[PDB]
Design a protein around this ligand. Structure first.
Ligand SMILES: CCCCCCNc1nc(NC2CCN(C)CC2)c2cc(OC)c(OC)cc2n1
Ligand SMILES: C[S@@+](CC[C@H](N)C(=O)[O-])C[C@H]1O[C@@H](n2cnc3c(N)ncnc32)[C@H](O)[C@@H]1O
Ligand SMILES: [Cl-]
Ligand SMILES: [Zn+2]
Ligand SMILES: [Zn+2]
Ligand SMILES: [Zn+2]
Ligand SMILES: [Zn+2]
Length: 260
């Protein structure tokens, strides 16, 4: 029997609820963190929010032409009219995406606005058999769809170096002054996504309200059709596994598993 242990881990902060179920053991809904739908800070990050530092477009249409500056900053606008990545998008080595912003001349419904509209997919936190909690999709997700943002506490590399728990860390830039998102204490649904060696999600660096290149936001897009019921996964990368490989091996179960 599948016990519903929370009707919505996000407490109404997302468009739709994200329930938590457990059909495996007696663990209640995780409660040792604070759910936040948007990134936060403790110690100040001097993110450059000078509005005059934004690059922006002057389009008079819906930003579907090659003349859109924001599309040019992105190399091209990668979004179709449904907000999905074009099949040409390089999932193995994604570009930076510059969405339209409040300095642009265009309207709030232009083509180059997806991640800034937030999470839309029906997701569920659930108890896996041997990897703790995980996240699944409740409905089919077509390829190239925005699924969720990796949300947490923005911290410096120096701060990350003095934290005990590094299992909920995302590195913003792999030399010099770099930053991390730590989802341990503050995070959204993405903090529960498990690692997979052939992942159905890819992280993409995105700029929206600011273009401080030290601080990309991390948007997971589907790399293929995700069927209703499937567990979400992304590739945690080599730093994670160099460290945690000493303690445990990857249980993703892929025939192409690289960390077993
Ligand atoms: C570069 C930013 N510093 C960082 N640090 C990690 N771990 C440290 C190891 C040393 N102790 C004392 C503090 C935490 C990370 C660990 C990670 O996975 C276990 C990771 O995954 C993407 C990123 C890390 N980034
Ligand atoms: C960010 S958390 C993911 C959510 C986690 N399962 C939980 O219950 O909180 C990362 C941790 O989950 C486990 N994990 C995630 N992916 C895994 C994998 N492919 N193989 C083994 N353990 C994994 C490891 O304990 C890892 O340090
Ligand atoms: Cl959208
Ligand atoms: Zn434009
Ligand atoms: Zn626009
Ligand atoms: Zn624009
Ligand atoms: Zn694996």
């Amino acid at each position: 029997v599948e016990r519903i242990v929370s009707r919505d881990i996000a407490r109404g902060y997302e468009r739709i609820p994200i329930p938590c179920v457990n059909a495996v053991d007696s663990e209640p809904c995780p409660s040792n963190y604070k759910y936040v739908s948007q990134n936060c800070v403790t110690s100040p990050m001097n993110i450059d929010r000078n509005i005059t530092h934004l690059q922006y477009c002057v389009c008079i249409d819906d930003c579907s032409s090659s003349n859109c500056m924001c599309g040019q900053l992105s190399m091209r606008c990668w979004y179709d009219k449904d907000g999905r990545l074009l099949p040409e998008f390089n999932m193995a080595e994604p570009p930076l995406i510059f969405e339209c912003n409040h300095a642009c001349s265009c309207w709030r419904n232009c083509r180059n606005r997806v991640v800034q509209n937030g999470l839309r997919a029906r997701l569920q936190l659930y108890r896996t058999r041997d990897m703790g909690w995980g996240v699944r999709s409740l409905q089919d997700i077509p390829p190239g769809t925005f699924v969720c943002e990796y949300v947490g506490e923005l911290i410096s590399d120096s701060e990350a170096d003095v934290r005990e728990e590094d299992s909920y860390l995302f590195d913003l830039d792999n030399d010099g002054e770099v930053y991390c998102i730590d989802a341990r204490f503050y995070g959204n649904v993405s903090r529960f996504i498990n690692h997979h060696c052939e992942p159905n999600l890819v992280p993409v660096r995105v700029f929206m309200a600011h273009q401080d290149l030290r601080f990309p936001r991390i948007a997971f897009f589907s790399t293929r059709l995700i069927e209703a019921g499937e567990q979400l996964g992304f590739d945690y990368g080599e730093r994670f596994w160099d460290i945690k490989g000493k303690l445990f091996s990857c249980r993703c179960g892929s025939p192409k598993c690289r960390h077993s």
